Every structure is written in structure tokens, then in C-alpha cells.
């Protein structure tokens, strides 16, 4: 859905591979197609729902000892710890 009129939040449009993409400034990560935010390095209670990578967020998993994990967004597989479209 990235077009010539997409406004990349803390990023910029660039042609990568075939078409337009938002590329993040500095070391920010993609939280969606057009939004770049800060990448936390720990998934715990202090970072729940924060970006932990391109299209990945810290989630709280309900079991016994409650756990946290960096999970990809719907439509992506954590492949060698990198979210990539399914």
C-alpha cells in the first residue's frame, strides 16, 4: 500500500527490490508499512507492546510463570529471528 503519497513516519520512501518502501531513519524499525519507531532490545514487562524489530512486538504470553516474546505481526514468520512475509 506504499505509494508516492505515503508519508513515512521517521523514515523515507525508497525503491528497494521492485517497488516503493518506507526505509527507517537512524536505527528505527518498522511497526507498519509507513511507521518507524524505536527498537527495544528486551522483551519484558517494561517493554510490552513495544517494537522489537521490523514488524515485531514484545508480547506477554499467558502460561504459569508468565513469559514475554518478540512475535511477528500477522503475515510474517520469524525466520532466523527476522520477520519476513508469509
Amino acid at each position, epitope marked *: 500500500k506504499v505509494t508516492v503519497d505515503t*508519508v513515512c*513516519k*521517521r523514515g523515507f520512501l525508497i525503491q528497494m527490490s521492485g517497488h516503493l518502501e518506507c526505509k527507517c*531513519e*537512524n*536505527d*528505527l524499525v518498522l511497526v507498519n508499512e509507513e511507521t518507524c519507531e*524505536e*527498537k*527495544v*532490545l*528486551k522483551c519484558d514487562e*517494561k*517493554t510490552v507492546n*513495544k517494537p522489537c524489530g521490523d514488524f515485531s512486538k514484545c508480547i506477554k504470553i499467558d502460561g504459569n510463570p508468565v513469559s514475554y516474546a518478540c512475535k511477528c505481526n500477522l503475515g510474517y514468520d520469524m525466520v532466523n529471528n527476522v520477520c519476513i512475509p508469509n
Partner: antibody, heavy 116, light 113 residues
Framework: QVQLQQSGAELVRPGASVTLSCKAS????????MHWVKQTPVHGLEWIGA????????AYNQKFKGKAILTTDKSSTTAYMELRSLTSEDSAVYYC?????????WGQGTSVTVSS | DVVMTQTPLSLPVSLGDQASMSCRSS???????????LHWYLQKPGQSPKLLIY???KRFSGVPDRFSGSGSGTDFTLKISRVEAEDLGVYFC?????????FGGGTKLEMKR
């Protein structure tokens, strides 16, 4: 490109106030906080405070509470710092800066000279 | 407040030398999000400080690759692999982990003779 254009040099009588401006252009104004920083030879670089332009909410270094007042105006994409009741200790260069985890761009600075 | 201390105050060098500067913090700069928000700036006379390295070792866009930062917790180090004339100026470190954000006093990189 990203530009922070600060207002010109100020000459201020002791006890008066003055308002400095920082016009932001080349980026989405509400996506970054604005920081203000004071520089003097004696005290070096000092963080004055930060303002979130989406909400106008400021946060202040305790040292500058009551001395500085940060506002933002969305329509003009400008941050303001008002300095109140100026003394000779307020003579300095004042910078605004665009912040998101790091201040990547700074204004050119505003000279403030306090003298009667 | 976190106090940031830089050594040396003056770094005399000849062009082509390597340069190394220290920045120490009174408190760990590790953020609860895992990151370390320690940055380095260069300020030339009459100009604003310009970002060189952010988050300990990441080079800002457009910065020559002769600049590198390293360190962890409280001790940080900026290195210039080969000093050029455009590098003379005052190098400031600063932390944005803890409010209020604070800067070191600066290391001035100057010409030796």
C-alpha cells in the same frame, strides 16, 4: 531537508522577559519532541526541557522550572521558549533541537545578552 | 542528576594522528528498554553541535567513517581513526537515558605544535 530556524539575537534588560522561536520545516512536526539547551562558557551545555508538539505538554529540568516556558504551535510548526525575569546568568546561546531517542538536528542557536 | 565527565579537556594532535577520548557517567546508562542512550557531538566555533555517533556506536548519516564509538554501562570512548583539519572542535558526550538529560564538559581537539 530538515531545518530548524531559530530567531535572531536578543538584547534584554534585566528583569524583562523574552520569547525565542524555533521554526521547524522538512519533517513531520508532531513526530518528534523539541528540546531546548542552554550553552555558556562557565556552565557548558544544559538541557532546559522538552516539549511534545502533539500535546503541548512540557517537561522541565528542575534547574529551569519557572525560568523557561515551552509552548508549541502546530499550524506554524514552531516551538517557543519564553525566558522570564532575566538576570546576567541568563546571557547565553540557546538551541532548540529535534529529538527522538537522540537529538539528530539542532537549530543554529540564539544569542541572548542581558544588559541594562 | 547523572554527571558526565570527559577526559582529556584538551586533546592536542597532529593531522593524520589517531585520537581517543573518554566519557564516563556517574550512573549506568542502560535504559529499561535495553538500549544505551549515549551520544557524541562535534561543535565547531560559532555553530551548533552536530551529531556524530548515537547510542554508543551507531554512526549518524553522513558522518565520515573515521569516527567510531564504543563502551558499556558507565565508560565510553570516541575514536577518530585519522585526524583531519575539519575534525578540530569540541566533542561533547551526552546521555538521554535519565531525566534530566545531561552533557559532558567537552574535549577540545586542537592542533599540536
Amino acid at each position: 531537508q530538515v531545518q530548524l530556524q531559530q530567531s535572531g539575537a536578543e538584547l534584554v534588560r534585566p528583569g524583562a522577559s523574552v520569547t525565542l522561536s524555533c521554526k521547524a520545516s522538512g519533517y513531520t512536526f508532531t513526530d518528534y519532541e523539541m528540546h531546548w539547551v542552554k550553552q555558556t562558557p562557565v556552565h557548558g551545555l544544559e538541557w532546559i526541557g522538552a516539549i511534545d508538539p502533539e500535546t503541548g505538554g512540557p517537561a522541565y529540568n528542575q534547574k529551569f522550572k519557572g525560568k523557561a516556558i515551552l509552548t508549541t504551535d502546530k499550524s506554524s510548526t514552531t516551538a517557543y521558549m519564553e525566558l522570564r525575569s532575566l538576570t546576567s546568568e541568563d546571557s547565553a546561546v540557546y538551541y532548540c533541537a529535534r529529538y527522538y531517542y537522540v537529538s539528530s538536528y539542532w537549530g543554529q542557536g540564539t544569542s541572548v545578552t542581558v544588559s541594562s | 542528576d547523572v554527571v558526565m565527565t570527559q577526559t582529556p579537556l584538551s586533546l592536542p594532535v597532529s593531522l593524520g594522528d589517531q585520537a581517543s577520548m573518554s566519557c564516563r557517567s556517574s550512573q549506568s546508562l542502560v535504559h529499561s528498554n535495553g538500549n544505551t542512550y549515549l551520544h557524541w557531538y562535534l561543535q565547531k566555533p560559532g555553530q551548533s553541535p552536530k551529531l556524530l555517533i548515537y547510542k554508543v556506536s551507531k554512526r549518524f548519516s553522513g558522518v565520515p567513517d573515521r569516527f567510531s564509538g564504543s563502551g558499556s554501562g558507565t565508560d565510553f570512548t570516541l575514536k577518530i581513526s585519522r585526524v583531519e583539519a575539519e575534525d578540530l572542535g569540541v566533542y561533547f558526550c551526552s546521555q538521554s537515558t535519565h531525566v534530566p538529560y545531561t552533557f559532558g564538559g567537552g574535549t577540545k581537539l586542537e592542533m599540536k605544535r
